[PDB]
Design an enzyme around this catalytic site. Structure first.
Site, PDB file in Angstrom:
ATOM      1  N   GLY A 137      -2.912  -2.542   5.193  1.00  0.00           N
ATOM      2  CA  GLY A 137      -2.918  -1.315   5.957  1.00  0.00           C
ATOM      3  C   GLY A 137      -3.708  -0.226   5.264  1.00  0.00           C
ATOM      4  O   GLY A 137      -4.884  -0.015   5.562  1.00  0.00           O
ATOM      5  N   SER A 138      -3.055   0.445   4.323  1.00  0.00           N
ATOM      6  CA  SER A 138      -3.667   1.534   3.563  1.00  0.00           C
ATOM      7  C   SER A 138      -4.148   2.656   4.479  1.00  0.00           C
ATOM      8  O   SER A 138      -5.101   3.364   4.170  1.00  0.00           O
ATOM      9  CB  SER A 138      -4.821   0.995   2.709  1.00  0.00           C
ATOM     10  OG  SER A 138      -4.358  -0.014   1.817  1.00  0.00           O
ATOM     11  N   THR A 139      -3.451   2.834   5.591  1.00  0.00           N
ATOM     12  CA  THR A 139      -3.807   3.854   6.558  1.00  0.00           C
ATOM     13  C   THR A 139      -3.408   5.245   6.059  1.00  0.00           C
ATOM     14  O   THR A 139      -3.979   6.255   6.471  1.00  0.00           O
ATOM     15  CB  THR A 139      -3.130   3.566   7.908  1.00  0.00           C
ATOM     16  OG1 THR A 139      -3.200   2.161   8.190  1.00  0.00           O
ATOM     17  CG2 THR A 139      -3.805   4.339   9.027  1.00  0.00           C
ATOM     18  N   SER A 189       0.832  -1.188   0.000  1.00  0.00           N
ATOM     19  CA  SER A 189       0.000   0.000   0.000  1.00  0.00           C
ATOM     20  C   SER A 189       0.875   1.248   0.000  1.00  0.00           C
ATOM     21  O   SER A 189       2.101   1.155   0.068  1.00  0.00           O
ATOM     22  CB  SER A 189      -0.929  -0.009   1.217  1.00  0.00           C
ATOM     23  OG  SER A 189      -1.906   1.014   1.127  1.00  0.00           O
TER      24      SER A 189
END
Length: 132
Positions: free
Chosen positions: A60-62, A25
């Site tokens: 994740g991709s937070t 990500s």
């Protein structure tokens, strides 16, 4: 073969297809100014500057909504990104950086797309044209 995908952003991009395979990500992975993938998968060490990036998804991709724009204003960002399951934070970043983001529902795209050939990403229509 030309697949129809679900488009979030618009625009159209032409470049060489690069497949990183793994679930990476925009938490990082790519150097913010150099555009070099510092993350490990297989094609580590190259730049994504002006080519087409294909990902299944990203763990994740937070974060990532900001990095896409930074890469783009450096010219070291990918022209377009095709995902099987994308993230809203990615969509926002891609919208600002003018990076045609489309989500493909069929796995056949990933079976067909390999690093090296040409994929025409048309997010205006929502289409990925694999041109040999």
């Amino acid at each position: 073969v030309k697949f129809a995908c679900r488009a979030i952003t618009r625009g159209r991009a032409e470049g060489e297809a690069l497949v990183t395979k793994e679930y990476i990500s925009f938490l990082g992975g790519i150097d913010k100014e150099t555009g070099i993938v510092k993350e490990d998968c297989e094609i580590k060490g190259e730049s994504v500057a002006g080519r087409i990036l294909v990902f299944p998804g990203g763990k994740g991709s937070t974060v990532g909504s900001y990095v896409l724009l930074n890469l783009r204003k450096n010219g070291v960002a990918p022209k377009a990104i095709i995902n099987k399951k994308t993230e809203t934070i990615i969509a926002v970043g891609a919208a600002m950086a003018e990076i045609p983001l489309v989500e493909v529902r069929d796995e056949k795209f990933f079976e067909a797309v390999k690093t090296g050939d040409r994929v025409v990403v048309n997010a205006d229509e929502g289409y990925v044209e694999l041109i040999e």
